[PDB]
């Protein structure tokens, strides 16, 4: 199929921007006491 | 010069003027009357 | 006065044959 | 595609369990969102402005976690007071019961047009 | 120091529930993503 | 004390039903809506702006009778009586579509005056006033369907008659002119209706179905006390039953109800932002790879180019009588038929 | 509760009912005499059932222009006549 | 017991023109069609 | 709090926090404004949507 | 590629069903 | 602790922080500006103003660039079509570069606000809390802000000490970089006038400079303060956010419909345009007077520009695009070479045939030839169907008058009816497809884009005002209601009025 | 120029998941007291 | 519980070092990877 | 989008020189 290329990036930066931010929030708050 | 549209402006300001008062006035006195 | 479950059944009555009217004019 | 060839054949938009149906599932958005606004909205102060108010419940606790009387008296000013329940165990019987018969009807529209009963 | 610093939180069933909805919203708009 | 004090004192008193500040905006606007509707619907036909019965005294059904759009020459003109097209005549503002306008700015204002009655009585009971904003999705709806997505097209014509079959119409016009269903905002707004109703129906059962007893008899509603401090129900059994059923279960309340509010609000906004894309008809009509892969193949044949097909039809068959103004005449040989395909 | 007298004391009496066998004929009567001698169709400009097309003419009168509509229903209306 | 009432306003502006309306409907019930 | 130059000239600018005009004040006269502007929307408003003709207003690209 | 992403999301979303269902915080009385 | 959305809940009662977070946005919002008009300089081809321009490449910022007078680049073309020129430092590249230059030092100073937070400044004289004169504030920033817009009025649009704007004919044909004089009589109010944008803001600058005078002078009334709460700054943020969602409905409106300040040289056509057939008017209009002095249909067909039969085509239409379908509008027809003429379609009689247009509404429409009366003549089938009004039976020839195969005729129903099919759309053009490799599918103009975005966030802004004004309006409530609250105060029938304890019978 | 589309994913990959690593690192390091 | 486990820590010199290291061996191998 | 690949890369080492060198954590004496 004759995809655009881009949708790509734009789906893996879709997941993993917003993602990786709330790893980074719970990670943050397990090393809490 | 006031056109026909110009005038039904008017006569809709006035209308909506007599309507808003109408209420309010009606509104104020029987908020007056009851205490 | 009047029971309440006169009042009720009359009504319902009532709303029962302005629905039949209804009815009737839509198969009319 | 099976929707828009069913609207084709039978007329389903025009059928009123289909008609029912929707009223379900629009009712009981409707009634989803109204019972947890008036339930959010009566929360029983526990916690700070900063700390997140779900932290004020906590896991089988006791006390009902909401004023229901706050939320009735709310809701029969919104609409009038015969329209509000003070009875928490009927209206989430209502709740149970709109969309569940909404969609026991919807469903049985569409097995009445499997059999060519079709929309008016 | 700023005495209206204050610590962030994010429990671990937000941190499901946000990976569900960061997730099935990248599924549903990949195809048009992609096009 | 002032008038306006004495003023604010009698709006705000305790009574059958609440008038407040918002009330002076709500209850005109609001009557004037319904009026509006039950007199056009009873009486008004939409001959001159659509060539449609819409009325009972036509004949019409309570299914198929309709406060039509304006014509689409009127364009977006707000169609007051006094305005330069109805120039003061009842008569001819009812002929032209003037209802409708009439009856979309004062359902818009009575919205606008319901909303502003939640946040006063949330004020003056003394609760948060979440039920407003809850209540900002279906304003959203409104305002993107009734007034932004005619804004942007070519009249208020391609607006929602206010009417059952009309909007049965508005539906099917929508799939076949805009594949709405294909669009992924009108996807996370069936998904926000339907898990609502799920949350209602499963919230409502199983409170129904955890209940404490707290009577003797067999009907438990009456063992309720709206004054009682306890749980009516258990959650922690809800929660047992729940997790080892589903595998995940709410075990607080309050989020619980938050997410009652939250699903079916985001829906309808969703729903809404997907609108105001159509009113601009940028809509997700098509996979421009899957139309490439069709040009280039004949045999390729999945259920999204036979839904386009469908709309095509949709499009031609309906094209004429919906749109009079356009003077379409579409000869048989042009027509899609599925035997020429 | 909020001082007014309640529904069902007021639609049980006697005095409600005798106001109430009068006003509601008479608005029924009103309603009647409005859709039957057909002053309802002057007053909304529904066409009759003998007005929607003219006597010649097989076109449905749609109006076209925004600042001569009136004039067209007009027109219409007399091409009827 | 007051009559004039907040309550009695709003049923009767709802009240009124539904009784005339149903006579109206009615009316058009026995048209020829 | 640190002392600058540009906050001792600033000061005098931010010194008033919570002094109101005691009563009414100005309302009347903000409520005459809001209604005028009020109007003037309208107004522009049914310039815009050609519900208020006004003689040489042509609402049009032809106007230019 | 556009199919991988897919099955990828989709297998990332049974992922996170397992991690919801069997590495959930527990729910704890009182 | 805090919620993720909660986070910037920290700022709310710290001025100096509040200050570096508005800093560092605004050097953000530099920098995006300065980048993206350095991406579309990179990307620009100023070759073709009139086939090719900026509105069919997808240029975004330019438009607003070239809106407000920076109409050359230092490479020496010019968007209006000359090159050599100088427009000496205020090009596009210095306009870009004056962006990324504010955006670094915005972003200097946001540091240094973060850091050095605690200044006096922003401390209550009195008792040492911080404390912002919320209302004070408001009468300088709208002084400020009437003197820009009095200036931006008086100055730069009139052309006393600035380049003026944007001005163009009604058809968009001759647009350029005018001085404006301001327009004083109620014409002023047409938003197709420009001279109503110089009065508009010369007189709402003046009156911005004297309300912002009365909002420092005097204080707001107790009942005011009071009601709308002005000692919490998310009021500012609710009404803020009010007049911000008003305001990008507005321009969202202003720029679907067209006005002055939305040309279509910048934005290119409206959907109104091609509905209202508004080119294909004033095309017929001038063929007819050519026509009429005594040309034959050739020379009045010739006659016709290149750029007003560009505007007379569907594919310059912003509402035929798609929401998914992306890039610049060369992306789908292709890039316009040039005009192939009128086509004039005729049966076996010689009897001129019109092609219905396609509507905007039409993802696809059928070809339908009709006479002058608006009886059907002729049709291409669907696919298969049989026929009686085809191009065969019925001997359809197209001839071309002006453009590139002016004098030309066909015959071949193959050709003719490529040519009706692409007839549909108004105005054939020849399309360069490869270069960027065009699928031939239709994408909306920067116009299109501008009015969906800001539709969209003048919604989503709505949302915002309504949840910011009910988090200041019930601020004391918003942790939870009262634990104490009295079933009474709730109930019917113990206090006369609703919530006034006062009142109690 | 003709480059590998697939570069762009794979920079930004080779970008993102290491150093958001490091991130989550960093950030849970900091709120350990 | 697990007697083995221990934090892990990461000082923000490290942090910058790293992210150093991942950025510059991005410039480096982009060219390539486009290629 | 190479060179935007490019420049952008460039753009962050020279931001994580800002702040490796202005946000550094202090060295402290003992
Ligand atoms: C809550 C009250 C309320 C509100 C908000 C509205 C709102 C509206 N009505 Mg409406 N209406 C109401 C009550 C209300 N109505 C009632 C009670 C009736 C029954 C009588 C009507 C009957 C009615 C009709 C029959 C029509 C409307 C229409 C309209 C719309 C346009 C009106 C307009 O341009 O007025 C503009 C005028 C104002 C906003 C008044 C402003 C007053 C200012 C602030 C004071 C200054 C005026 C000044 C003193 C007067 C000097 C004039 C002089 C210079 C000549 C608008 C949405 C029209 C419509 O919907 O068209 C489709 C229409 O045709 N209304
Ligand atoms: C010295 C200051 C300065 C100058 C001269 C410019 C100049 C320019 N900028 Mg720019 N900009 C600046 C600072 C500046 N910028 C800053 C600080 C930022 C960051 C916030 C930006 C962010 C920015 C963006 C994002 C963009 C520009 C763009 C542009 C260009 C078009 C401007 C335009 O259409 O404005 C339009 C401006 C308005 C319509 C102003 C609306 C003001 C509202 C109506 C005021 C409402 C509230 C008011 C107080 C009400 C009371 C009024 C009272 C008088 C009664 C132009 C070359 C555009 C461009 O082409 O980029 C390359 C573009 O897209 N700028
Ligand atoms: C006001 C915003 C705005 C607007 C109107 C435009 C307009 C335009 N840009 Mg542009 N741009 C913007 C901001 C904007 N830009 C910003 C901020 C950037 C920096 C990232 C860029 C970077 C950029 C580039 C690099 C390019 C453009 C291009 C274009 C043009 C083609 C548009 C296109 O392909 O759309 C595509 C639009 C979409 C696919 C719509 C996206 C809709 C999203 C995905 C929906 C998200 C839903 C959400 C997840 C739901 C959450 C649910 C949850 C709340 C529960 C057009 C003129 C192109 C062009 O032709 O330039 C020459 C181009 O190459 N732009
Ligand atoms: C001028 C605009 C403006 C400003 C200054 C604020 C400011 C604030 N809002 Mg608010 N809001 C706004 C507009 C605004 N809002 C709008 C338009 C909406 C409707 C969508 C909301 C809805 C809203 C809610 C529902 C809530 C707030 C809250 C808050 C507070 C904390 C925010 C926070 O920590 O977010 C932190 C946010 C993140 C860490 C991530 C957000 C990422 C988003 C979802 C997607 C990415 C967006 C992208 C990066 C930005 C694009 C810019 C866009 C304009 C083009 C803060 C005072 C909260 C509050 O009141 O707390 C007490 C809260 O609960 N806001
Ligand atoms: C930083 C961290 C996060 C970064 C990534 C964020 C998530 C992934 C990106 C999301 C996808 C969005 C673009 C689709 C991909 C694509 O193909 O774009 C690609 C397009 C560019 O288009 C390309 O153009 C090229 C020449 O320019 C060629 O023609 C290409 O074929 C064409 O694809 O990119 C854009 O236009 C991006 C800017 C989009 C701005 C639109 C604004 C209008 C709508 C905004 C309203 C918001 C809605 C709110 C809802 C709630
Ligand atoms: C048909 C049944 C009516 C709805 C009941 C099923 C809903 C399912 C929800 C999930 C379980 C919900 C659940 O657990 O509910 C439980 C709820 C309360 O339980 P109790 O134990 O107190 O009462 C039920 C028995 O034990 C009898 O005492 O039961 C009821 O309220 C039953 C009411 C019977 C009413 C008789 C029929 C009335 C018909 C109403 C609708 C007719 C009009 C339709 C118009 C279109
Ligand atoms: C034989 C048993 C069969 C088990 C089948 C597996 C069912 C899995 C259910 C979902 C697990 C993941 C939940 C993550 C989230 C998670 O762990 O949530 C757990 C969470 C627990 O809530 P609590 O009350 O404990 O949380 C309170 C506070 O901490 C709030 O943060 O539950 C919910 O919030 C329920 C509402 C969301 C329910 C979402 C269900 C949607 C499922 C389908 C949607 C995606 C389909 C995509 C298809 C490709
Ligand atoms: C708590 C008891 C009910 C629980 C179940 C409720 C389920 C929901 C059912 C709702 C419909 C039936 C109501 C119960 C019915 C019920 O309980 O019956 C009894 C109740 C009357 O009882 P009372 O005689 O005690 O009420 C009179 C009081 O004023 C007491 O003096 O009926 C009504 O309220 C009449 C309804 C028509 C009133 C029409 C007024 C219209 C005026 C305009 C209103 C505008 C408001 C909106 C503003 C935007
Ligand atoms: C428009 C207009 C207006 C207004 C008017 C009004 C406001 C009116 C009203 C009206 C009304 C207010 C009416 C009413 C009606 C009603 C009706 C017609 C009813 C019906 C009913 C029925 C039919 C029933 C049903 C039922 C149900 C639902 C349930 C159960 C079953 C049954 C079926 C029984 C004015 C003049 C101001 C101005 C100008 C314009
Ligand atoms: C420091 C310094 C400097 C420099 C500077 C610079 C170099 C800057 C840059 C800047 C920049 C270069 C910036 C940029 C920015 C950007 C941005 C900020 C963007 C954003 C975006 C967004 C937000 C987006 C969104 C979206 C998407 C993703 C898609 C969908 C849709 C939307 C639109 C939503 C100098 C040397 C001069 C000097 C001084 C200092
Ligand atoms: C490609 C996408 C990249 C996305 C990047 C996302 C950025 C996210 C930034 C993380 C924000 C948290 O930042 C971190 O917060 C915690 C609290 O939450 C702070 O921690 C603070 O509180 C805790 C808890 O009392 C104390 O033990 C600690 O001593 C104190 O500093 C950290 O000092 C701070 O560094
Ligand atoms: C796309 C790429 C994605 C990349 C993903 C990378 C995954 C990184 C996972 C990091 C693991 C850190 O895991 C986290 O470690 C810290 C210590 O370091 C633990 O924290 C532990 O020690 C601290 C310090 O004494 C205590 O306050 C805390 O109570 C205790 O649990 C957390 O309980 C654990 O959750
Ligand atoms: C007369 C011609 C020269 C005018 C120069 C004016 C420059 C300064 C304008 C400042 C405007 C302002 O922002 O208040
Ligand atoms: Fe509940």
């Known amino acids: 199929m004759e995809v655009n290329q881009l949708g790509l990036i734009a789906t893996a930066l879709f997941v993993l921007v917003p993602s990786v931010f709330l790893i980074i929030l719970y990670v943050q708050t397990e090393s809490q006491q | ?35 | 006065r009047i029971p309440l479950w006169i009042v009720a059944t009359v009504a319902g009555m009532g709303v029962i044959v302005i629905v039949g009217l209804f009815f009737y004019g839509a198969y009319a | 595609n099976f929707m828009i060839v069913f609207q084709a054949e039978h007329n389903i938009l025009m059928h009123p369990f289909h008609q029912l149906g929707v009223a379900g599932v629009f009712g009981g958005a409707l009634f989803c969102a109204m019972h947890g606004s008036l339930v959010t909205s009566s929360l029983i102060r526990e916690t700070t402005e900063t700390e997140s108010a779900n932290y004020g419940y906590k896991f089988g606790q006791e006390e009902e976690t909401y004023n229901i009387v706050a939320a009735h008296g709310y809701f029969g000013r919104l609409i009038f007071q015969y329209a509000s329940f003070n009875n928490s165990r009927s209206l989430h019987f209502f709740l149970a019961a709109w969309p569940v018969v909404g969609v026991w009807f919807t469903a049985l529209g569409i097995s009445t047009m499997a059999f060519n009963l079709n929309g008016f | 120091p700023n005495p209206n610093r204050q610590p962030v939180e994010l429990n671990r069933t937000s941190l499901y529930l946000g990976l569900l909805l960061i997730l099935v919203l990248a599924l549903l708009f990949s195809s048009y993503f992609f096009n | ?341 | 509760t909020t001082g007014e007298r309640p529904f069902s004391d007021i639609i049980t009496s006697v005095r409600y009912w005798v106001i109430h066998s009068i006003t509601i004929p008479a608005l029924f009567i009103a309603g009647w005499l409005f859709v039957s001698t057909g002053l309802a169709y002057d007053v909304f400009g529904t066409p009759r059932p003998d007005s929607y097309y003219a006597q010649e003419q097989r076109s449905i009168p749609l109006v076209t222009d925004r600042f001569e509509a009136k004039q067209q229903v007009e027109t219409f209306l007399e091409q009827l006549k | ?33 | ?64 | 590629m556009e199919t991988i992403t897919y099955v990828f999301i989709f297998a990332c979303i049974i992922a996170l069903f397992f991690f919801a269902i069997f590495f959930r915080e527990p729910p704890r009385i009182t | 602790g805090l919620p993720w959305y909660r986070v910037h809940t920290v700022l709310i009662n710290d001025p100096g922080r509040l200050i570096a977070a508005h800093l560092m946005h605004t050097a953000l919002v530099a920098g995006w500006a300065g980048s993206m008009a350095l991406y579309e300089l990179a990307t620009f081809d100023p070759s073709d103003p009139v086939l090719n321009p900026m509105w069919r490449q997808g240029m975004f910022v330019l438009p607003f660039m070239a809106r407000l007078g920076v109409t050359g680049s230092w490479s020496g073309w010019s968007i209006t079509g000359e090159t050599g020129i100088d427009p000496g430092f205020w090009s596009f590249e210095g306009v870009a570069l004056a962006h990324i230059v504010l955006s670094g030092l915005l972003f200097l100073a946001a540091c240094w606000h973060w850091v050095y937070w605690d200044l006096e400044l922003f401390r209550d004289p009195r008792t040492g809390e911080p404390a912002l004169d919320l209302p004070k504030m408001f009468g300088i920033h709208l002084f400020l802000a009437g003197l820009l817009c009095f200036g931006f009025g008086a100055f730069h649009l009139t052309g006393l000490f600035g380049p003026g704007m944007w001005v163009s004919d009604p058809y968009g044909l001759t647009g350029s970089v005018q001085p404006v004089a301001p327009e004083w009589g109620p014409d002023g109010f047409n938003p197709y006038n420009p001279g109503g944008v110089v009065a508009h803001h010369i007189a709402a600058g003046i009156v911005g400079i004297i309300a912002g005078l009365f909002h420092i002078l005097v204080r707001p009334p107790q009942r005011l303060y009071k009601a709308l709460r002005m000692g919490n700054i998310e009021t500012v943020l609710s009404s803020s956010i009010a007049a911000v969602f008003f305001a990008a409905f507005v321009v969202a409106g202003t720029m679907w419909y067209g006005s002055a300040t939305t040309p279509i040289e910048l934005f290119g056509p409206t959907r109104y345009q091609w509905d209202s057939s508004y080119f294909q008017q004033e095309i017929n209009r001038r063929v007819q007077a050519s026509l009429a002095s005594g040309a034959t249909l050739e020379e009045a067909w010739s006659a016709i520009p290149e750029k007003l039969a560009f505007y007379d085509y569907i594919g310059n239409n912003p509402a035929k695009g798609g929401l998914f379908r992306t890039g610049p509008m060369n992306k789908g027809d292709g890039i316009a070479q040039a005009w192939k003429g009128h086509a004039v379609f005729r049966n076996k009689e010689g009897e001129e045939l019109f092609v219905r247009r396609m509507p905007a509404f039409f993802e696809s429409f059928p070809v339908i030839l009709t006479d002058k009366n608006g009886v059907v003549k002729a049709d291409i089938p669907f696919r298969r169907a049989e026929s009686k009004y085809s191009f065969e039976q019925q001997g359809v020839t197209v001839s071309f008058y002006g453009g590139e195969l002016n004098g030309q005729t066909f015959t071949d129903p193959p050709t003719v009816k490529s040519y009706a099919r692409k007839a549909i759309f108004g105005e054939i053009f020849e399309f360069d497809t490869e270069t960027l490799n065009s699928d031939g599918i239709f994408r909306t103009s920067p116009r299109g884009w501008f009015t969906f975005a800001h539709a969209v966030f003048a919604l989503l802004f709505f949302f915002g005002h309504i949840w910011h004004g009910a988090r200041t309006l019930f601020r004391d409530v918003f942790s939870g209601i009262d634990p104490e609250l009295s079933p009474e105060q709730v109930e019917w029938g113990f206090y006369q009025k609703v919530g006034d304890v006062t009142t109690r019978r």
């Not at chain 6, 305005?83 to 579509?97: I, K, M, S, V, Y």
């Open chain 2, 1 to 35: 010069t006031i056109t026909p549209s110009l005038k039904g402006f008017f006569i809709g300001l006035l209308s909506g003027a007599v309507v808003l008062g109408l209420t309010f006035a009606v509104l104020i006195a029987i908020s007056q009357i009851d205490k």
């Open chain 6, 1 to 341: 004390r002032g008038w306006f004090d004495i003023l604010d004192d009698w709006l705000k008193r305790d009574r059958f039903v609440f008038v407040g500040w918002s009330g002076i905006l709500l209850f005109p606007c609001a009557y004037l809506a319904l009026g509006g509707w039950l007199t056009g619907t009873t009486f008004v036909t939409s001959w001159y702006t659509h060539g449609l019965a819409s009325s009972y005294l036509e004949g019409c059904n309570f299914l198929t009778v309709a406060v039509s759009t304006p014509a689409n020459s009127m364009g977006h003109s707000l169609l007051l009586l006094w305005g330069p097209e109805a120039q003061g005549d009842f008569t001819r503002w009812c002929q032209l579509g003037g209802l409708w306008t009439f009856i979309a700015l004062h359902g818009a204002f009575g919205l606008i005056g319901f909303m502003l009655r939640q946040f006063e009585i949330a004020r003056l009971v003394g609760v948060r006033p979440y039920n407003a904003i809850a209540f900002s999705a279906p304003i959203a709806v409104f305002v993107s369907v009734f007034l932004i997505y005619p804004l942007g097209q070519s009249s208020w014509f391609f607006a929602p008659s206010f009417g059952v079959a009309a909007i049965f119409r508005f539906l099917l016009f929508f799939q076949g002119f805009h594949n709405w269903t294909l669009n992924p905002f009108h996807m996370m707004g069936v998904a926000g209706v339907l898990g609502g109703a799920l949350l209602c129906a499963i919230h409502g059962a199983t409170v129904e179905n955890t209940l404490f007893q707290d009577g003797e008899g067999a009907s438990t509603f009456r063992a309720f006390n709206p004054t009682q401090a306890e749980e009516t129900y258990s959650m922690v059994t809800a929660n047992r039953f729940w997790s080892q059923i589903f595998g995940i279960a709410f075990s607080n309340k309050r989020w619980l109800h938050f997410f009652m509010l939250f699903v079916p609000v985001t829906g309808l906004w969703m729903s809404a932002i997907g609108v105001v894309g159509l009113a601009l008809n940028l809509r997700s009509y098509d996979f421009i790879s899957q139309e490439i892969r069709a040009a280039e193949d004949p045999e390729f044949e999945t259920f999204y180019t036979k839904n386009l097909l469908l709309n095509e039809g949709i499009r031609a068959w309906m094209a004429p009588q919906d749109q009079p103004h356009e003077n379409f005449v579409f000869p048989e040989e042009v027509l899609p038929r599925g035997n020429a395909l």
């Open chain 8, 1 to 33: 017991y007051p009559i004039f009432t907040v309550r009695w306003v709003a049923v009767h502006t709802l009240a009124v023109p539904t009784i005339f309306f149903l006579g109206a409907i009615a009316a058009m019930q026995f048209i020829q069609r």
């Open chain 9, 1 to 64: 709090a640190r002392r600058t130059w540009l906050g001792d000239i600033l000061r005098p600018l931010n010194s008033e926090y919570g002094k109101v005009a005691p009563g009414w004040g100005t309302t009347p006269l903000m409520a005459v404004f809001m209604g005028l502007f009020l109007v003037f929307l309208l107004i522009i408003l049914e310039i815009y949507n050609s519900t208020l003709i006004l003689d040489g207003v042509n609402v049009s690209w032809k106007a230019l």
